[PDB]
Design a protein around this ligand. Structure first.
Ligand SMILES: CNC(=O)c1cccc(Nc2nccc(N3CC(Oc4ccc(F)cc4C)C3)n2)c1
Ligand SMILES: *[C@@H]1O[C@H](CO)[C@@H](O[C@@H]2O[C@H](CO)[C@@H](O)[C@H](O)[C@H]2NC(C)=O)[C@H](O)[C@H]1NC(C)=O
Ligand SMILES: *[C@@H]1O[C@H](CO)[C@@H](O[C@@H]2O[C@H](CO)[C@@H](O)[C@H](O)[C@H]2NC(C)=O)[C@H](O)[C@H]1NC(C)=O
Ligand SMILES: *[C@@H]1O[C@H](CO)[C@@H](O)[C@H](O)[C@H]1NC(C)=O
Ligand SMILES: *[C@@H]1O[C@H](CO)[C@@H](O)[C@H](O)[C@H]1NC(C)=O
Ligand SMILES: *[C@@H]1O[C@H](CO)[C@@H](O)[C@H](O)[C@H]1NC(C)=O
Ligand SMILES: *[C@@H]1O[C@H](CO)[C@@H](O)[C@H](O)[C@H]1NC(C)=O
Ligand SMILES: *[C@@H]1O[C@H](CO)[C@@H](O)[C@H](O)[C@H]1NC(C)=O
Ligand SMILES: *[C@@H]1O[C@H](CO)[C@@H](O)[C@H](O)[C@H]1NC(C)=O
Lengths: 173, 1140, 120
C-alpha cells in the first residue's frame, strides 16, 4: 500500500528532480476525490505563489515563468483518488530553490457523508551544482571499512598469540 | 401362573429384538420434523409397545412387592419416565407441548440398554468423566482467571465505533443513539465497512486504529456479533475465553480485540493460546488417556469335457505364476489410480476418450483376472477369501457401468486398498478403520446414538424458532446455511460442533431461540460429544499401538574456532544479521539512514561469515567439514550470500534469478540452529522422527488421493458461478441459469463475472488443497456451500441443489481427517517413545543444562512433611501462632479469597458510580484484611515466615496490591494514563492466584506445567525461529498483495509486526485459508499486475500461487509437527507427575 | 395464532378506573414505524366495531363521543404491552374490547378480546 515518504532536499543544477508529496488516506478502502495545488516561494522571498493545480486528470500550470515548460506531473494516473501528488522538474534551474507547499484537497465519500479534508505538505529544496553524498552514507562506509580492518587485526592478533603459545607448547616436546 | 409366562416371554431374544426394532422405527420417526396426521396412531402403537414391555417386566419383577427389584435397576427409570411423559401427553398436557415432545428423545437412549455392550460402554464413559473432574475444575479456574484478565484489559473496548464528525440538525451523539435503531440508519452514522453486520471497531491507541477521515473513535452502541462477542461482563469474558480455549473462530476474537485495543495485546492472546488452549486441551487429553488406559489394563488383567476341464484348470493354476502376476495386478492397480487422477474440468475430447478407453481397458483386465481366478479357485474355495470377495464386489460394481451417475464410477478407487498386504502402514490404516467397527463398534455406535439424540433434540427445540423468524439472523428472511429446522441440517450442526465450530451457530441459535436454552444445548453437545469423540480416538489409538608449520596453523585455527569467545561472537553476529532483516519492509524508503546502515552491515556480516567459513576449513579439514550437516548448511547460506554480494558489487546483476535469490536472505536465521542447543535437540528429534512421518504421509497421500479423485469426479468444474461483483452475490439462478446466459448478462451489464472458487476440485492438486482445508476445518464452509449448490459443469449453482454432498464431506472428515490424524499422532508418539527408549530413557527435548534443572525441579515433588515451626515463648505470641496455624484460619482466608474473586467478577461495563465506589471500598477492605493477616502471621513467625514459597508469594502479592492501590492514588494525583491504570490494576489477580495453594489437584497439574516448561521453551525457540524465517519470507513476497479477505490494513505481511501477528494466528491453523485467499489470485481481474503503490518502486498487487501455496501449506505442516512435539512433551510430563 | 394475553372477562365497578390489560408476544424487537396497534369497542357481540385508539408511529386517540375523554393509553408497547385505561367507567362502557396487533416483520396479527362488565 501507500507509504508516506519525504521528498529529496537537494536538486542539482541543469538536471531533473522529482519532488515527492505522498499523502494517503487513513483507510485505503475508502474512495475519495482528490485534487492538489502547489505553492512555492523562491529562496530570499517572503510569499507563496501558486504554480500548478492538478485536477481530475489535467495538470494546469500557472503563468509563473520560473516553471514554464519545465514541470510535468509525476503522481497517480487515471485514478481520481490521487493519493500521490509529486511533480517532476525537468532542467532544474537556480530559481527552483525555496519552500514548496503541497496542498492536498481530499473529498472522501461515505454512506451519506462527504468529508472535506486538506493536507498541506511543505517541502524545502535547495538547488546545487554537484550532488553531495549523504553524510550518513559516507560515515557508514568509512565505519564499515574501520570495522572490517579492526576485526581482521583482532583476528590476526589472536592468531599470532595462539600461534606463539602452541609454538612454546611444541618446543616443550 | 401369569408371572411364569411373563418371565418366560421376558427373557427372550425375540422380545429383546422386538423392542430394539420398535425403538429403531421410533428413532426413524422422531426425525419427521413435521409428522403427518396419520402418525398419531403410529406413536400410539409405539407407546403401547413400550407400556406393554414395561408391564411385562413389572409382572415378572414385582408381583405385589412394590416393583422393588424392578426399580432397583437404574435403566428402567428411563422407560418409566418415558411412559409417564407419553401418557401425560396423551392425557391433559401442558402448554409447553413441543418442550415435552422433545422429551420423547429418551426413547433413543433406550437403545443403550436394549443393545448389548452399550451399557458397559456408557459405564466406561461415566467412569472417565470421574477422572476428568479435576482438570475440569482446573480449566474452570484458568478460564475464570484469564476472563478477569481479559475483562480488566478490554472492558468495553469492543464497543468502539468510528462515529461521524459533522452531525447536522444540531444533533448530538446521544440524540442520535436514542432515535436510530435500524441497521441502515446505523450505517448512515457509523462506519460499517461495506458488507459487515457490525460497525468497524476503532482504536484510541496509535497502532490499533484506524478511523477514516471524518470519523472519530467512541465506544457507543452494542458489541459485535449480535452483542455476544465482548469482554464487558464477566460472563461474556468467560464465554469468549472458552471460545479461545477451544479455538473456535478464535481468530476473529483475536482480530477484533487487536483492532479495538491495540496490536500490543498480541501478548495477551499468545499467553492465552499457548497456555490456556494448548495446555488445558492437552491436559484433558492426557487425563482421558490415563483414565482409559488404566481402565483397559485393569480390564484385561482382571479378565486373564471334464478331463479337458481338469487340464484347463491345471494350466490356469500354473499360469497364474504366484510370484509374478500378483505384482502385475498391483502395478496395474497403481497405474489405474494414477490414470484416474489425471482428470480435470477443462479436458480436451482427445484426453476424455483416452481416459475412457483406459478405464475400460483396466476394468477389462480386472474382470479377466476375476474370471480366471474364479475358475482356478473353485467358486466355493474362491469366495473363501475376504480379499477375493471384495475384489468380486468391486469388479461387479465396475462392469455395471460399461454398457449400462458419478459416485458409482467413483468406486474403482477402493482397489488401491489391495496394496495393503504389501504396505505395512496401509495395513495399519486398514486395521484402524476395522477396529472402529470391530472391537470399538460399540463405542462408534454410542457416538452415533449421541449425535442422533442431539440432532433430534436441537431440531425439536429450535427448528420452530428458526422458521418463526430467521429475519433476526438473516436479511433475506430465508433459513441460513446452518439451521436446525430439518433433521439433516440439525445433524450437520451437531457434527460441526463435534468439530470445533460451535460459536458461529450458537450466535444465530441464541438470537432466534433464547440464550439460556441455546447455551445449555450447545454446551451439552460440546462437552459430551467431544468427550466421546476423544474416548473413541484414544481407544483406537491405544488399541492399534498396543617444518610442518601447516599443522601448527591448523592447531591455531582449531583453538580459534572452538574458543568460546569466537563462538559467542559468531552467535552475536548471527543474531544481528538476522534481526537486520526485520527492518526491510514497505516502510524502508523512509528511514533512509537505517536503510544505508543495514546495506553496509550486510557486507560486514557476509565478510565475517566468509572468514568464519575459511577458519573452519583450515581448522577442521574438508573431510570433517563437508561430512557435517550443520557445516553444509552454513556453507550453503554463506555461498548464497557471497553470490549476491559479488553480483551486486559487480553490477549488471539485478535480473531474474538474482532478485529471486536475494529473497533467500530469509534463510540467514537458519544459522542459529547449529548454535542454540535447545533448537538443535528439537531439530534432532524431528529429524529422527521424519522417516515414519514420510511413511504415514505416503499412506495419507494415497487416501486423500482416493478422496480427491472422488471429489474431482463429483465437483470437477461445478463451482463456477457468476456473482455480482458490487456486493458479491450469486444471481438468482432463475434468470442467468447457465454460463452462456451469464455471458450475455456480462455483455449487457459490466458488474457480473463468471468466477470460480480458487480452492476447488478442478483437478487433483486443487483437490488436495481443498481437502487440506476441509480437514483442518479452516476454509471448508465456502467449499461445502458451493459443493452442495453444484448443479452441473456449466450450470449456475442452485441453493442447496445437491444438499447431500454434505455426506461426502462428513465421510471425508470422519475417514481422512479423524482416522488419518489418528494414525499420524499414534505413529508419532510411537516413534518418540522408541527414540526415548533409545536415548537411555531420557527426555528428548531437553539439553544437559535443562535436564539438570529438570531434576532439581522434579525434586520439588517432595512427599516429606517439613517441621512446621518452633512456637515462641511469649504467651500472646503463642496465641497468635495457633491463631495463624489453625486450619479454620487458613480455610477462612481461602473463603475471603473466593469472595475477592466474586467481587472482581461482579464488575462490568457501564456500571453506576455508586457501584464503582462500593466495589472500590470492598476491594480496599479486602486488601487491608489480607495485609493484616499477613502482618500478624509475620509477627508470629518473624524469622521463619519466608522459608516457604507460598508464603513468599503471599508477601509478594500483598506488596504488589498495596503498590497498585497507591499507584492508583498517585495516578489520580499526578498522571493521566488509562492503559497503564488497567495494566496496574491487573495486579489484584495475584490474590486470586493464591487459590492454588489449597487445591492439590490444581497444584499437581500446575507442577506438570512447570515440569514441561523447559521442553516447551526449546520447542518455542525452534517455533519462533521458523516463524521468523517465514515472517521474512512473508514480508518479501506477500507484501503488496491485495487486501481481499483475511489480509487487511491491520493484519498483513507489510511489516514484521503484521507478519509475525498473522503467523502466530496461523500457528494454530486459524484463518490460513483467509490469509492464502488474496495470495492465490492473479490473472486480472482478480488483481492488477502493474499497480503503482505510491512510496515504493515495486509494482503489481498479485501473489504467486505457487509460492503462496508452498509457504502456507509448509507452515501449516511444520506448525502441526511442532505442536505435536509440544503435545508429546506435556503428555509425558503429566504421565510422570501423575504417577508420582 | 399470535400470543396475546388479556382477561376474557373484566368486571369493574361503575365509577372506578378500568385498566384493560393485554399481553402481546412475538419474536424480534418492536419497530416504531413497523409496530401498529388498534383498539376497537362493540356494544354487543354482533355489534359493529368502533376503533377508538390506534398506534401508527405514535398513539392516536380517536376521541369517540361514546367515551368522552375517558380513554387513555396505558401501555409501553416495546414491552409487548398495549393496555388501555378507561377512566371513571360508566354503565354504557359494557361491551367487547378488541386489541389487534400487527408487528413487522411478523406476518401474523394478534387479537385479544375482553368482555367488560360494569357492576352497580
Ligand atoms: C477439533 N479438531 C481440530 O481442530 C483438528 C483435528 C485434526 C487436525 C487439525 N489440523 C491442524 N494442522 C496444523 C496444526 C494444528 N494444531 C492446533 C492444534 O490442534 C488443535 C485443534 C483444536 C483444539 F481445540 C486443540 C488443538 C491442540 C495443533 N492442527 C485440527
Ligand atoms: C449488483 O448489485 C448492485 C447493488 O448491490 C445493483 O445496483 C443497483 O441497481 C439498480 C438498478 O440498476 C438500482 O436501482 C440500485 O440503486 C442499485 N444499487 C446499488 C447499491 O448500486 C446492480 O444492479 C447489480 N447488478 C446487476 C447486474 O443486477
Ligand atoms: C442455458 O439457459 C438458456 C436460458 O433458458 C437456454 O436458452 C435457450 O435459448 C433461448 C434463449 O433465451 C430460449 O428461448 C430457449 O427456450 C432456451 N432453450 C431451452 C431448451 O430452454 C439454453 O438452452 C441453456 N443451455 C445452453 C446455452 O447450453
Ligand atoms: C530566475 O530568477 C532570476 C532572478 O530572480 C531572473 O532574472 C530569471 O529570469 C529567472 N529565470 C527565468 C527562467 O525566468
Ligand atoms: C515523471 O515524468 C517523467 C517525464 O518527464 C517520466 O519519465 C517519469 O516516468 C515520470 N514518473 C512517474 C512516477 O510518473
Ligand atoms: C537545460 O537547458 C539548457 C538551456 O536552457 C540546455 O543548454 C541544457 O542542455 C539543458 N539540459 C538538460 C539536461 O536538458
Ligand atoms: C471543500 O470542498 C469544496 C468543494 O466541495 C472545495 O472547493 C474546497 O476547496 C474544499 N476545501 C477544503 C478546505 O477542503
Ligand atoms: C440546536 O439546534 C436547534 C435547531 O437546529 C436549535 O433550535 C437549538 O437552539 C440548538 N441548540 C443549541 C444549544 O444551540
Ligand atoms: C457483446 O456482443 C457483441 C456482438 O453484438 C460482440 O461483438 C462482443 O464481443 C460481445 N462482448 C462480450 C463481452 O460478450
Amino acid at each position: 500500500g501507500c507509504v508516506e515518504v519525504d521528498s529529496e532536499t537537494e536538486a542539482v543544477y541543469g538536471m531533473t528532480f522529482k519532488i515527492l508529496c505522498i499523502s494517503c488516506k487513513r483507510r485505503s478502502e475508502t474512495n475519495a476525490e482528490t485534487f492538489t495545488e502547489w505553492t512555492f516561494r523562491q529562496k530570499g522571498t517572503e510569499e507563496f505563489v501558486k504554480i500548478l493545480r492538478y485536477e481530475n486528470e489535467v495538470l494546469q500550470l500557472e503563468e509563473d515563468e520560473r516553471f514554464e515548460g519545465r514541470v510535468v506531473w509525476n503522481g497517480s494516473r487515471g485514478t481520481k483518488d490521487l493519493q500521490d501528488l509529486s511533480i517532476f522538474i525537468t532542467n532544474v534551474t537556480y530559481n527552483h530553490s525555496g519552500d514548496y507547499e503541497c496542498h492536498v484537497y481530499r473529498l472522501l465519500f461515505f454512506e451519506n457523508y462527504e468529508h472535506n479534508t486538506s493536507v498541506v505538505k511543505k517541502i524545502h529544496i535547495e538547488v546545487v551544482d554537484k550532488a553531495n553524498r549523504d553524510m550518513a552514507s559516507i560515515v557508514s562506509e568509512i565505519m564499515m571499512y574501520v570495522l572490517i580492518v579492526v576485526l581482521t587485526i583482532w583476528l590476526v592478533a589472536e592468531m599470532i598469540y595462539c600461534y606463539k603459545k602452541i609454538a612454546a607448547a611444541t618446543e616443550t616436546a | 401362573p401369569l408371572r411364569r409366562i411373563s418371565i418366560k416371554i421376558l427373557v427372550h431374544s425375540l422380545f429383546s429384538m422386538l423392542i430394539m426394532c420398535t425403538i429403531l422405527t421410533n428413532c426413524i420417526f422422531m426425525t419427521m420434523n413435521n409428522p403427518p396426521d396419520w402418525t398419531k396412531n403410529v406413536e400410539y402403537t409405539f407407546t403401547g409397545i413400550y407400556t406393554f414391555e414395561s408391564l411385562v417386566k413389572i409382572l415378572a419383577r414385582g408381583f405385589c412387592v412394590g416393583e422393588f427389584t424392578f426399580l432397583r435397576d437404574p435403566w428402567n427409570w428411563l422407560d418409566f419416565v418415558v411412559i409417564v411423559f407419553a401418557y401425560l401427553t396423551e392425557f391433559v398436557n401442558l402448554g409447553n407441548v413441543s418442550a415435552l415432545r422433545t422429551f420423547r428423545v429418551l426413547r433413543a437412549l433406550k437403545t443403550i440398554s436394549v443393545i448389548p455392550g452399550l451399557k458397559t460402554i456408557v459405564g466406561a464413559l461415566i467412569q472417565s468423566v470421574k477422572k476428568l473432574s479435576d482438570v475440569m475444575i482446573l480449566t474452570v479456574f484458568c478460564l475464570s482467571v484469564f476472563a478477569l484478565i481479559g475483562l480488566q484489559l478490554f472492558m468495553g473496548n469492543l464497543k468502539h465505533k468510528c462515529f461521524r464528525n459533522s452531525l447536522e440538525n444540531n444533533e448530538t451523539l446521544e440524540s442520535i443513539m436514542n432515535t436510530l435503531e435500524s441497521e441502515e440508519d446505523f450505517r448512515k452514522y457509523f462506519y460499517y465497512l461495506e458488507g459487515s453486520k457490525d460497525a468497524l471497531l476503532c482504536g484510541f491507541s496509535t497502532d490499533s486504529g484506524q478511523c477514516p477521515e471524518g470519523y472519530t473513535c467512541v465506544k457507543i452502541g452494542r458489541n459485535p456479533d449480535y452483542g455476544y462477542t465482548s469482554f464487558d461482563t464477566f460472563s461474556w469474558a468467560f464465554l469468549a475465553l472458552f471460545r479461545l480455549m477451544t479455538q473456535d473462530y478464535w481468530e476473529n476474537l483475536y482480530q477484533q480485540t487487536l483492532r479495538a485495543a491495540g496490536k500490543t495485546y498480541m501478548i495477551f492472546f499468545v499467553v492465552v493460546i499457548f497456555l490456556g488452549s494448548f495446555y488445558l486441551i492437552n491436559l484433558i487429553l492426557a487425563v482421558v488417556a490415563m483414565a482409559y488406559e488404566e481402565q483397559n489394563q485393569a480390564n484385561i488383567e482382571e479378565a486373564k469335457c471334464s478331463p479337458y476341464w481338469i487340464k484347463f484348470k491345471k494350466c490356469i493354476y500354473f499360469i497364474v505364476m504366484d510370484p509374478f502376476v500378483d505384482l502385475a495386478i498391483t502395478i496395474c492397480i497403481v497405474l489405474n489410480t494414477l490414470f484416474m487422477a489425471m482428470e480435470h474440468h477443462p479436458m480436451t475430447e482427445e484426453f476424455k476418450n483416452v481416459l475412457a478407453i483406459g478405464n475400460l481397458v483396466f476394468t477389462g483386465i480386472f474382470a479377466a483376472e476375476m474370471v480366471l481366478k474364479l475358475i482356478a479357485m473353485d467358486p466355493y474355495e474362491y469366495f473363501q477369501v475376504g480379499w477375493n470377495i471384495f475384489d468380486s464386489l468391486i469388479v461387479t460394481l465396475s462392469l455395471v457401468e460399461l454398457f449400462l451417475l458419478s459416485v458409482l464410477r467413483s468406486f474403482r478407487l477402493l482397489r488401491v486398498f489391495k496394496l495393503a498386504k504389501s504396505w505395512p502402514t496401509l495395513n495399519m490404516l486398514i486395521k484402524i478403520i476395522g477396529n472402529s467397527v470391530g472391537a470399538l463398534g460399540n463405542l462408534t455406535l454410542v457416538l452415533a446414538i449421541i449425535v442422533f439424540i442431539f440432532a433430534v433434540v436441537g431440531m425439536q427445540l429450535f427448528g420452530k424458532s428458526y422458521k418463526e423468524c430467521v429475519c433476526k439472523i438473516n436479511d433475506d428472511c430465508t433459513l441460513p446455511r446452518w439451521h436446525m429446522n430439518d433433521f439433516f441440517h440439525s445433524f450437520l450442526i451437531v457434527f460441526r460442533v463435534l468439530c470445533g465450530e460451535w460459536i458461529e451457530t450458537m450466535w444465530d441459535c441464541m438470537e432466534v431461540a433464547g440464550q439460556a436454552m441455546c447455551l445449555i444445548v450447545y454446551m451439552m453437545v460440546m462437552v459430551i460429544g467431544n468427550l466421546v469423540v476423544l474416548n473413541l480416538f484414544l481407544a483406537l489409538l491405544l488399541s492399534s499401538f498396543s617444518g610442518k608449520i601447516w599443522w601448527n596453523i591448523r592447531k591455531t585455527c582449531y583453538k580459534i574456532v572452538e574458543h568460546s569467545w569466537f563462538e559467542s561472537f559468531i552467535v552475536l553476529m548471527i543474531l544481528l544479521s538476522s534481526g537486520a532483516l526485520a527492518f526491510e519492509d514497505i516502510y524502508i524508503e523512509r528511514k533512509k539512514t537505517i536503510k544505508i546502515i543495514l546495506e553496509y552491515a550486510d557486507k560486514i556480516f557476509t565478510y565475517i561469515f566468509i572468514l568464519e567459513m575459511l577458519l573452519k576449513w583450515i581448522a577442521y579439514g574438508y573431510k570433517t567439514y563437508f561430512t557435517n550437516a550443520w557445516c553444509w548448511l552454513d556453507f550453503l547460506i554463506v555461498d548464497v550470500s557471497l553470490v549476491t554480494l559479488v553480483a551486486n558489487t559487480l553490477g549488471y546483476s539485478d535480473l531474474g534469478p538474482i532478485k529471486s535469490l536475494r529473497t533467500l536472505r530469509a534463510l540467514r536465521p537458519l544459522r542459529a540452529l547449529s548454535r542454540f542447543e535447545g533448537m538443535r535437540v528439537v531439530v534432532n528429534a524431528l529429524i529422527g522422527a521424519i522417516p515414519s512421518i514420510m511413511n504415514v504421509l505416503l499412506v495419507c497421500l494415497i487416501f486423500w488421493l482416493i478422496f480427491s479423485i472422488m471429489g474431482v469426479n463429483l465437483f470437477a468444474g461445478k463451482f463456477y458461478e457468476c456473482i455480482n461483483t458490487t456486493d458479491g452475490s450469486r444471481f438468482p439462478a432463475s434468470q442467468v441459469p447457465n454460463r452462456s446466459e451469464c455471458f450475455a448478462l456480462m455483455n449487457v451489464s459490466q458488474n457480473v463475472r463468471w468466477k470460480n472458487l480458487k480452492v476447488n476440485f478442478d483437478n487433483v492438486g486443487l483437490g488436495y488443497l481443498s481437502l487440506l482445508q476441509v480437514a483442518t476445518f479452516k476454509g471448508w464452509t465456502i467449499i461445502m456451500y458451493a459443493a452442495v449448490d453444484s448443479v452441473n459443469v456449466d450450470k449456475q449453482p442452485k441453493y442447496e441443489y445437491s444438499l447431500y454432498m454434505y455426506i461426502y464431506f462428513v465421510v471425508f472428515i470422519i475417514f481422512g481427517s479423524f482416522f488419518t490424524l489418528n494414525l499420524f499422532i499414534g505413529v508419532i508418539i510411537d516413534n518418540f517413545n522408541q527414540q526415548k527408549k533409545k536415548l537411555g530413557g531420557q527426555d528428548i527435548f531437553m539439553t544437559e543444562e535443562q535436564k539438570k534443572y529438570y531434576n532439581a525441579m522434579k525434586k520439588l515433588g517432595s512427599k516429606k512433611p517439613q517441621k512446621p515451626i518452633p512456637r515462641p515463648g511469649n504467651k500472646i505470641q503463642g496465641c497468635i501462632f495457633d491463631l495463624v496455624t489453625n486450619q479454620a484460619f487458613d480455610i477462612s482466608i481461602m473463603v475471603l479469597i473466593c469472595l475477592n474473586m466474586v467481587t472482581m467478577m461482579v464488575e462490568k461495563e457501564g456500571q453506576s458510580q455508586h457501584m464503582t465506589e462500593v466495589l472500590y471500598w470492598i476491594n480496599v477492605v479486602f486488601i487491608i484484611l489480607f495485609t493484616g493477616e499477613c502482618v500478624l502471621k509475620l509477627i508470629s513467625l518473624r524469622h521463619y515466615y519466608f522459608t516457604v514459597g507460598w508464603n513468599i508469594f503471599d508477601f509478594v502479592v500483598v506488596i504488589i496490591s498495596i503498590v497498585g492501590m497507591f499507584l492508583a492514588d498517585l495516578i489520580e494525583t499526578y498522571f493521566v494514563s488509562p492503559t497503564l491504570f488497567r495494566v496496574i490494576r491487573l495486579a489484584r489477580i495475584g490474590r486470586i492466584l493464591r487459590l492454588v495453594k489449597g487445591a492439590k489437584g490444581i497444584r499437581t497439574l500446575l507442577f506438570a506445567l512447570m515440569m514441561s516448561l523447559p521442553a516447551l521453551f526449546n520447542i518455542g525457540l525452534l517455533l519462533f525461529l521458523v516463524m521468523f524465517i517465514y515472517a521474512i519470507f512473508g514480508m518479501s513476497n506477500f507484501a503488496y498483495v491485495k487486501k481481499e479477505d483475511g489480509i487487511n490494513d491491520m493484519f498483513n505481511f507489510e511489516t514484521f509486526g503484521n507478519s509475525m501477528i498473522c503467523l502466530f494466528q496461523i500457528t494454530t491453523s486459524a484463518g490460513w485459508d483467509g490469509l492464502l485467499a488474496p495470495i492465490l489470485n492473479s490473472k486480472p481481474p482478480d488483481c492488477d499486475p502493474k499497480k503503482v503503490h505510491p512510496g515504493s518502486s515495486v509494482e503489481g498487487d498479485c501473489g504467486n500461487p505457487s509460492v503462496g501455496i508452498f509457504y502456507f501449506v509448509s507452515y501449516i505442516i511444520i506448525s502441526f509437527l511442532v505442536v505435536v512435539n509440544m503435545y508429546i512433551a506435556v503428555i509425558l510430563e503429566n504421565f510422570s507427575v501423575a504417577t508420582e | 395464532s399470535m400470543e396475546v394475553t388479556v382477561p376474557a372477562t373484566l368486571n369493574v365497578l361503575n365509577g372506578s378506573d378500568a385498566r384493560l390489560p393485554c399481553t402481546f408476544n412475538s419474536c424480534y424487537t418492536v419497530n416504531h414505524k413497523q409496530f401498529s396497534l388498534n383498539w376497537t369497542y362493540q356494544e354487543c357481540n354482533n355489534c359493529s366495531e368502533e376503533m377508538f385508539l390506534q398506534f401508527r408511529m405514535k398513539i392516536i386517540n380517536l376521541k369517540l363521543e361514546r367515551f368522552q375523554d375517558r380513554v387513555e393509553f396505558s401501555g409501553n408497547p416495546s414491552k409487548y404491552d398495549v393496555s388501555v385505561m378507561l377512566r371513571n367507567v360508566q354503565p354504557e362502557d359494557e361491551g367487547i374490547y378488541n386489541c389487534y396487533i400487527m408487528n413487522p416483520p411478523d406476518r401474523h396479527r394478534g387479537h385479544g378480546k375482553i368482555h367488560l362488565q360494569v357492576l352497580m
